Amino acid sequence: SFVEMVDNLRGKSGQGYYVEMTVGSPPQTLNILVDTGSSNFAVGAAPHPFLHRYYQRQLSSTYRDLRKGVYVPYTQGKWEGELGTDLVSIPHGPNVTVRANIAAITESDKFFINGSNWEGILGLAYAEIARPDDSLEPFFDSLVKQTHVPNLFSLQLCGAGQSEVLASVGGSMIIGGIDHSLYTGSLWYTPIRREWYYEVIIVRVEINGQDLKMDCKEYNYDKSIVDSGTTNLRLPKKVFEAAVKSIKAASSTEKFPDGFWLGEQLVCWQAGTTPWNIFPVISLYLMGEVTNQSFRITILPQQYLRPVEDDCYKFAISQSSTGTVMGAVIMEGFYVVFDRARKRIGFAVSACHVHDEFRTAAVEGPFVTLDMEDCGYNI
Numbered sequence: 001s002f003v004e005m006v007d008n009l010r011g012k013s014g015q016g017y018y019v020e021m022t023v024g025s026p027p028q029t030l031n032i033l034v035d036t037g038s039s040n041f042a043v044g045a046a047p048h049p050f051l052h053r054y055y056q057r058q059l060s061s062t063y064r065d066l067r068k069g070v071y072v073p074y075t076q077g078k079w080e081g082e083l084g085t086d087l088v089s090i091p092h093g094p095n096v097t098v099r100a101n102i103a104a105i106t107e108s109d110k111f112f113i114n115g116s117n118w119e120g121i122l123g124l125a126y127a128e129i130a131r132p133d134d135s136l137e138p139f140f141d142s143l144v145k146q147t148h149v150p151n152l153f154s155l156q157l158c159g160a161g162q163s164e165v166l167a168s169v170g171g172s173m174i175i176g177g178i179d180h181s182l183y184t185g186s187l188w189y190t191p192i193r194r195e196w197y198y199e200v201i202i203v204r205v206e207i208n209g210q211d212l213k214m215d216c217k218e219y220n221y222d223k224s225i226v227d228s229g230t231t232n233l234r235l236p237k238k239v240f241e242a243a244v245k246s247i248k249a250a251s252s253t254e255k256f257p258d259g260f261w262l263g264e265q266l267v268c269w270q271a272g273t274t275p276w277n278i279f280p281v282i283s284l285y286l287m288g289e290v291t292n293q294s295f296r297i298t299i300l301p302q303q304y305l306r307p308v309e310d311d312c313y314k315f316a317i318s319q320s321s322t323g324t325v326m327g328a329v330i331m332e333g334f335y336v337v338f339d340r341a342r343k344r345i346g347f348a349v350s351a352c353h354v355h356d357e358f359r360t361a362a363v364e365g366p367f368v369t370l371d372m373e374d375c376g377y378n379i
C-alpha cells in the first residue's frame, strides 16, 4: 500500500486504463495498459502510425535477447513480437526494479488504438494463459519473486465523473497491499476458482430486484472472469438476452433503436436530462468464501451506460460466446483486491463510486444460496 500510488492510472473512456512504466537503462518511459485478462507484458518496439514512441532495445544496456518469437491474439486486436528481458520499474508503484520478460512488438493489427496514449500492455493474470506457453513468467510473478512485494494488488478504476474528445478517466493500482482510504464498508471475497484468468463464480443475477431464475451454470457458461482489459460487462448468450429483455421493460416509457441495445449505436438526451431512474440496477451475486454463502455487487446505469463524444451514451453490456466478462464498467465504482496469496478477489464500495440521489453501487452480504460449486463449468 502507498499514498504515492493513488491516481497512478489514466485512460480514455472505452480504451482501458494505463500506468506509467520504464523499461531499459537508461529508463525509457512508456504508458502501459493494465490488463487482468491476459498474462503477457508487451510493448510497441517498432514504428506504428498510432504510436508516438516505443521501446528501442538497442538503446538499453541491460537488454538481453531471448532469441524466441511470441504472438498473442486478443478478442480482435493482435500482435507479433520478440522476447527478451530488461529492467522494469513503475515510477508511481513500488520503489523497486525487476528483470521481467518483455515481448517487443514488431507487427500488430487492430491492437494499438488511435489517441489512446498507451504503448504497451501489462498482463496481470497467471502463467497458464501466457504465450507462447506457461514457462514465460508473467511480470507480477517476477516482481514478487525478485522483491519482498506481497503477492497482492488492488485496482480502483474510476468513471469519467470533454465535448468532441473521449472523456478522460482515472484510477489507482495499489501494488502489494490494500489501501483502506480507497473504499468504504466491508470487503467481501469470492474465491479464485482457478489460477489462469481471474476466474470466479456467479451464483445469482437480479435486475431491479428480480431474479433471472436461470440455472446458475448459465451465468458461468464457459467461465466467469474479472478482466480490466475488456470495457463492457459481457454476458453469455442466454443471460444477455434475458438481461436486455428486462432492462428494456424497466425503461419502456422511452424507446431506443435496436442499434443502442446492440452496443454499437449511441443514444442521447439534452444535457443533464439523462433519465437514470428508468434504467434498473443489476446485482451479480458471487460465491462466498463459505459454502452456501454469497454476496452481491450492485451496478447502476451510470456504470453500464458509457459516455462518448458529442450527453451521449453507448450500452456497455454485450453478448459473449466465451463466458461472463466482468469488464471495466463493472469494476468502476468498486475497489477490487486481487489477493493472489489467498486465492480470492475482494470487492468493496469505492470512494469514487457513482453516488446518485436515491440509489448507489453496493457490496452486500451474506446471502444464503444452497449449492454453488455446481454453478461451475467442469473442464
Ligand SMILES: CC(=O)N[C@@H](Cc1cc(F)cc(F)c1)[C@H](O)CNC1(c2cccc(C(C)(C)C)c2)CCCCC1
Pocket: 015, 016, 033, 035, 037, 038, 039, 072, 073, 074, 075, 076, 077, 078, 110, 111, 112, 129, 197, 225, 227, 229, 230, 231, 322, 325
Ligand atoms: C478487448 C480485449 O481484447 N481486451 C484484452 C486486452 C486488450 C485491450 C485493448 F485496449 C486492446 C487489445 F487489443 C487488447 C483482454 O486481454 C481480453 N481478455 C480476454 C481474452 C480474449 C482473447 C484472448 C485472450 C488471451 C490474451 C488470454 C489469449 C484473452 C477476453 C475474453 C475472456 C478471456 C479474457
